[PDB]
């Protein structure tokens, strides 16, 4: 309220909050290397009208070889970031 | 009064409340000039000394948008304070008609009493009255007579209650202890003696 | 409300200046205004009184008007019907960011002030307020109140019992016309419905998007990193800021209407109760013999002992 | 996928097996299932609330009390004694904790049964003095009795000029758009 001498009364001030204590992270016990070393490094790379689709589940994602090796001409992400993608558990990645 | 207004304190507070509302509104407006709105600076030209083009005009659009909304918020709250201040101003005009030019016979609005007179005095941004009110305070013990039954017939008094049935002696007002001799001239003939719950004879 | 929490949002919030300070100041002022409202409406008799428990005056039944010692609680039966009539639509523990503050005046003591006003109305004489009380037995009250219509006690004492009867039944019919009835207790429900829809629409604004990817924080926070981040977050904060500012300004407009009605509320608990208000079709649709306060959720409900003059003759002048 | 901050507890539902989240009023999660076979409610308000200083006015005192709002007055002790409050002071320790009238914690004021006539509005009836924190004397409670027969008139009186402050004109301001 910007005074040394302040009159008497309940005066508003800041908003307190209890700082949190620790950390709780809860994932499944799903524990598996992905087929990214072969679903990307594949053999049968199809046509365009006959584009291939795989659903991949039950895995643990790496996102690490994709950056430390510049084999890729165009990297692009749309509804998502690139690097912070390795925070979240996902449902059913789709290789197209 | 030369006590209550002179050495005294915040029992004149509302006018400083008005001025403090003005000051906080206006100082908030100036501090919004000192604030950014997602652009680079809080002050123009400063940026335009180091801004180039379309980048530049996007940032100046940000600043102009924010300055505009903050200003408009000031406008709206001023208008709201103006509406409240004018409803109270209509009250002020009201009591300067009602309570000043006559005795406003309505009760416990002029001050805290029965309002014998009133004296306005001017003020910065407002007006401060001096309400010449009334406060009656002494007390007693007296007994009742809702009527008067002299010869077998009733006399409701003058309706304006409490006949002075202190020893069944006289007639009385509402507010002041007052001896009033009963005659025929002072009450009215109302039928026989039906429900005279305090009976008084010799009312001649 | 805004900005719910991450880390980045507080920095982007204090980008926009003292908006947090502005809104919290304005709602603090509205809170203090509502405090002033209930003080100036109710706390108008300083020196309180006693529920006198004579409760029967020739025939003058104040049944259920006053809370009674025979009750379990101390809220009167009429007002208990009033509480039961009015719906909604430990402490509040919800991360909207919001709250209803608790009121100032204690709810039973809200009722105790109503009891005080009604009881000293039922006693104490006309001079009541501007003084304290002056020992008048309440039939002398209406015998005095016949001057604010300009008639005699030949009304009252020549018709004594009859008058009380037309009192009691109608009050009992009040018990009908407030239990059995409907929307003719509207404006309290109307106030709560305004605030309900306004605040719930504000909640839905927290569900709302503003042209961003998500409509909720911590969602984008896993797939935002940088400038993309702050663009989407600036959209969210901008919209939540505009919507909240809209809410605050409308709360202020509502509170202005409430305080004009509160001026009226004090005016009808003063002019109508503490004396008889001689002005015409102000208190009620009669010549306004008495009126009694009653509490209610978030508002006051009066009871206007009006006066409907009703028979008809023909004469020559 | 869900980050955030809050107070967990086990679930209290008729939770369907295909569902996972709760979003109860408007997208506000409030209930989840652990990914390693347990079921939990998530009331994310750890706590919050405004605080407010209660001070006698730096002209007869310098001792405060600090009203917290949205707490039930045992969370505050754990916030103090593991240093978890955001206005983390130093020169500060708990005198007491008067709490009911659910407006929240009040640090540094005593209960008083002899309730006074309420200087300062602490929340829900409760008010301060000196610094104590009583509930409220609602005024001065005058018991009264009024029989039928018994009447008094005022026999002397007073005049009492008092103030009243009626604002009219605010500052006649104006604003250049151009500057």
Author numbering:
A (entry chain B): 290 to 385
B (entry chain B): 916 to 1119
C (entry chain A): 723 to 811, 832 to 1059
D (entry chain B): 531 to 660, 674 to 722
Q: What do the study authors state?
A:
The spike (S) glycoprotein of the coronavirus is a class I viral fusion protein located on the outer envelope of the virion that plays a critical role in viral infection by recognizing host cell receptors and mediating fusion of the viral and cellular membranes. The coronavirus S glycoprotein is synthesized as a precursor protein consisting of ~1,300 amino acids that is then cleaved into an amino (N)-terminal S1 subunit (~700 amino acids) and a carboxyl (C)-terminal S2 subunit (~600 amino acids). The S1 subunit contains a receptor-binding domain (RBD), while the S2 subunit contains a hydrophobic fusion peptide and two heptad repeat regions. Among these, CTD1 is the receptor-binding domain, and one CTD1 in the trimer adopts an “up” conformation as a prerequisite for the binding of SARS-CoV to the cellular receptor angiotensin-converting enzyme 2 (ACE2).
The S-ACE2 complex was then prepared using trypsin-cleaved and low-pH-treated S glycoprotein and ACE2. After 3D classification and refinement, three conformational states of the S-ACE2 complex were captured and determined at resolutions of 5.4 Å, 4.2 Å and 4.5 Å. The ACE2-bound states showed that the SARS-CoV S glycoprotein binds one ACE2 receptor utilizing only the “up” CTD1. However, the “up” angles of the CTD1s from the ACE2-bound conformations were in the range of 50° to 111.6°. The CTD2s of the unbound-up and ACE2-bound conformations exhibited a hinge motion away from the spike axis compared to CTD2 in the unbound-down conformation. Upon binding to the receptor ACE2, CTD2 tended to exhibit a hinge motion away from the S2 stem. The S2’ cleavage site located in a surface pocket of the stem around Arg797 and covered by a “C”-shaped loop (residues 787–796) is inaccessible in both the unbound-down and the ACE2-bound SARS-CoV S glycoprotein structures. However, we did not observe more than one ACE2 or more than one “up” CTD1 in one spike.
